[PDB]
Design a protein around this motif. Structure first.
Motif, PDB file in Angstrom:
ATOM      1  N   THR A  97     -61.630 -97.993 -45.256  1.00 18.45           N
ATOM      2  CA  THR A  97     -60.229 -98.057 -44.831  1.00 18.45           C
ATOM      3  C   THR A  97     -60.190 -97.778 -43.333  1.00 18.45           C
ATOM      4  OG1 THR A  97     -59.592 -95.710 -44.993  1.00 18.45           O
ATOM      5  CG2 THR A  97     -59.647 -96.993 -47.033  1.00 18.45           C
ATOM      6  N   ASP A  98     -58.991 -97.814 -42.765  1.00 16.40           N
ATOM      7  CA  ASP A  98     -58.849 -97.501 -41.341  1.00 16.40           C
ATOM      8  C   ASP A  98     -58.757 -96.011 -41.072  1.00 16.40           C
ATOM      9  OD1 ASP A  98     -56.105 -96.745 -41.584  1.00 16.40           O
ATOM     10  OD2 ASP A  98     -55.427 -98.796 -41.172  1.00 16.40           O
ATOM     11  N   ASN A  99     -58.790 -95.210 -42.129  1.00 15.69           N
ATOM     12  CA  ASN A  99     -58.828 -93.765 -42.017  1.00 15.69           C
ATOM     13  C   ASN A  99     -57.609 -93.143 -41.327  1.00 15.69           C
ATOM     14  OD1 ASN A  99     -62.259 -94.390 -41.715  1.00 15.69           O
ATOM     15  ND2 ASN A  99     -61.412 -93.092 -43.342  1.00 15.69           N
ATOM     16  N   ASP A 114     -57.062-102.953 -45.534  1.00 14.77           N
ATOM     17  CA  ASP A 114     -56.414-102.935 -44.240  1.00 14.77           C
ATOM     18  C   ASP A 114     -54.927-103.132 -44.408  1.00 14.77           C
ATOM     19  OD1 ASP A 114     -58.436-102.706 -42.028  1.00 14.77           O
ATOM     20  OD2 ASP A 114     -59.294-104.389 -43.201  1.00 14.77           O
ATOM     21  N   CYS A 115     -54.179-102.802 -43.372  1.00 18.32           N
ATOM     22  CA  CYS A 115     -52.747-103.075 -43.362  1.00 18.32           C
ATOM     23  C   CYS A 115     -52.442-104.157 -42.340  1.00 18.32           C
ATOM     24  CB  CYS A 115     -51.945-101.835 -43.089  1.00 18.32           C
ATOM     25  SG  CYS A 115     -52.352-101.145 -41.422  1.00 18.32           S
ATOM     26  N   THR A 116     -51.361-104.871 -42.599  1.00 23.85           N
ATOM     27  CA  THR A 116     -50.898-105.913 -41.691  1.00 23.85           C
ATOM     28  C   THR A 116     -49.393-105.987 -41.809  1.00 23.85           C
ATOM     29  OG1 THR A 116     -51.521-108.073 -40.775  1.00 23.85           O
ATOM     30  CG2 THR A 116     -51.066-107.962 -43.108  1.00 23.85           C
ATOM     31  N   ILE A 140     -47.860-104.941 -45.456  1.00 20.23           N
ATOM     32  CA  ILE A 140     -48.696-105.577 -46.462  1.00 20.23           C
ATOM     33  C   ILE A 140     -50.030-104.875 -46.491  1.00 20.23           C
ATOM     34  CG2 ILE A 140     -49.871-107.739 -47.118  1.00 20.23           C
ATOM     35  CD1 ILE A 140     -47.717-109.198 -45.522  1.00 20.23           C
ATOM     36  N   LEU A 141     -50.465-104.428 -47.671  1.00 23.20           N
ATOM     37  CA  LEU A 141     -51.855-103.969 -47.812  1.00 23.20           C
ATOM     38  C   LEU A 141     -52.695-105.132 -48.313  1.00 23.20           C
ATOM     39  CD1 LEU A 141     -51.734-100.370 -49.385  1.00 23.20           C
ATOM     40  CD2 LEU A 141     -51.903-101.070 -47.017  1.00 23.20           C
ATOM     41  N   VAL A 142     -53.850-105.296 -47.689  1.00 19.82           N
ATOM     42  CA  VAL A 142     -54.813-106.317 -48.015  1.00 19.82           C
ATOM     43  C   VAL A 142     -56.130-105.657 -48.399  1.00 19.82           C
ATOM     44  CG1 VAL A 142     -56.006-108.341 -47.119  1.00 19.82           C
ATOM     45  CG2 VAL A 142     -53.735-107.757 -46.312  1.00 19.82           C
ATOM     46  N   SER A 163     -53.222 -92.343 -41.069  1.00 19.77           N
ATOM     47  CA  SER A 163     -52.380 -91.261 -41.503  1.00 19.77           C
ATOM     48  C   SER A 163     -52.158 -91.256 -43.005  1.00 19.77           C
ATOM     49  CB  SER A 163     -51.022 -91.297 -40.818  1.00 19.77           C
ATOM     50  OG  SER A 163     -50.327 -92.513 -41.096  1.00 19.77           O
ATOM     51  N   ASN A 164     -52.164 -92.438 -43.608  1.00 16.05           N
ATOM     52  CA  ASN A 164     -51.840 -92.525 -45.017  1.00 16.05           C
ATOM     53  C   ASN A 164     -53.063 -92.193 -45.875  1.00 16.05           C
ATOM     54  OD1 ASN A 164     -52.441 -95.047 -43.633  1.00 16.05           O
ATOM     55  ND2 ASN A 164     -52.218 -96.127 -45.585  1.00 16.05           N
ATOM     56  N   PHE A 165     -54.179 -91.842 -45.228  1.00 10.10           N
ATOM     57  CA  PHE A 165     -55.396 -91.425 -45.934  1.00 10.10           C
ATOM     58  C   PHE A 165     -55.776 -89.958 -45.740  1.00 10.10           C
ATOM     59  CE2 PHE A 165     -55.814 -95.957 -45.025  1.00 10.10           C
ATOM     60  CZ  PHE A 165     -55.945 -96.446 -46.314  1.00 10.10           C
ATOM     61  N   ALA A 208     -43.613 -98.700 -47.944  1.00  8.16           N
ATOM     62  CA  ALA A 208     -43.881 -98.003 -46.689  1.00  8.16           C
ATOM     63  C   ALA A 208     -45.334 -97.643 -46.667  1.00  8.16           C
ATOM     64  CB  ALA A 208     -43.018 -96.730 -46.565  1.00  8.16           C
ATOM     65  N   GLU A 209     -45.873 -97.468 -45.463  1.00  6.39           N
ATOM     66  CA  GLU A 209     -47.280 -97.135 -45.280  1.00  6.39           C
ATOM     67  C   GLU A 209     -47.477 -95.638 -45.449  1.00  6.39           C
ATOM     68  OE1 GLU A 209     -49.086 -99.432 -42.179  1.00  6.39           O
ATOM     69  OE2 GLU A 209     -50.671 -97.945 -41.860  1.00  6.39           O
ATOM     70  N   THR A 210     -47.382 -95.187 -46.694  1.00  7.58           N
ATOM     71  CA  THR A 210     -47.458 -93.773 -47.012  1.00  7.58           C
ATOM     72  C   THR A 210     -48.588 -93.497 -47.960  1.00  7.58           C
ATOM     73  OG1 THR A 210     -46.042 -94.036 -48.963  1.00  7.58           O
ATOM     74  CG2 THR A 210     -44.987 -93.517 -46.873  1.00  7.58           C
TER      75      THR A 210
END
Ligand SMILES: Cc1c(CO)cnn1-c1ccc(F)cc1
Ligand SMILES: Cc1c(CO)cnn1-c1ccc(F)cc1
Ligand SMILES: [Cl-]
Ligand SMILES: [Cl-]
Lengths: 133, 136
Positions: free
Chosen positions: A59-61, A8-10, A17-19, A63-65, A35-37
């Motif tokens: 994952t949250d599926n 997940d991201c936070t 932050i990636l967790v 944009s970055n996926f 960056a969330e890329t």
């Protein structure tokens, strides 16, 4: 199962932050990323997969996926894409003042989360994987 | 000890890589860092200590270990300060052209090194078995 992780991201202080949580144990790997890329996400996943047996990542599926990069990294590493995280922020809160940089505070929080105890999350992940082996 | 690591630096393409080896298993954690400074070394050591039970590190005792920062980080985390570079470099060499950025190639190399089965156990399996045994 032992090879299953959630990613997940936070967000704090304008940073990302990636967790990653090892679902069976509650063990966490987390890092500030630039960056969330797709590129930075792939990098993070590759790093994780070299350290622990990652079979599947939920994952949250977002944009970055959707891009070629994460797909390519998961392919390469043999990963399938198929309570700890508010707590992580809380610990970061408790320790933020002792570090100048957020990134340091994040790693102190990961340490505290994984070592807190009859078993810590760090002991649990190891026991689970050793048993699976 | 299950808790003993060796930390070394190695250099490629004008960049600095820290390599931590879990001595009993041969398992490696390595990352490109911005500069070989106390602050970045401390950061690397805190990251490692949150992921594995680090009790003692053996380092080269150079300049990035003389300052207040690494000493403070090791204190905090309860760490005592008391072939790979080449191998890892060889794998990096082998994969370098598949990644744009050295940092990526380094993490591919760590993956390969830790998963490689020479027959048999990988280093990744050995570290987990050793620490799990110690815990029990
Ligand atoms: C070293 C330690 C503590 C106390 O520092 C709590 N859990 N752990 C721990 C963490 C991870 C392990 F693999 C084994 C033990
Ligand atoms: C997933 C895997 C491979 C590839 O099958 C080789 N070693 N490992 C591995 C690495 C670390 C472990 F804790 C357990 C297994
Ligand atoms: Cl994300
Ligand atoms: Cl060094």
């Amino acid at each position: 199962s032992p090879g299953i992780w959630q990613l997940d991201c936070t967000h704090l202080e304008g940073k990302v932050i990636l967790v990653a949580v090892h679902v069976a144990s509650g063990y966490i790997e987390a890092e500030v990323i630039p960056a969330e890329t797709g590129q930075e996400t792939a990098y993070f996943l590759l790093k994780l997969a070299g350290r622990w047996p990652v079979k599947t990542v939920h994952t949250d599926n977002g944009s970055n996926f959707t891009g070629a990069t994460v797909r390519a990294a998961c392919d390469w590493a043999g990963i399938k894409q198929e309570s700890m995280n508010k707590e992580l922020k809380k610990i970061i809160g408790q320790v933020r003042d002792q570090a100048e940089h957020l990134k340091t505070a994040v790693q102190m929080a990961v340490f505290i989360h994984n070592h807190k105890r009859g078993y810590s999350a760090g002991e649990r992940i190891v026991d689970i994987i050793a048993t699976d082996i």
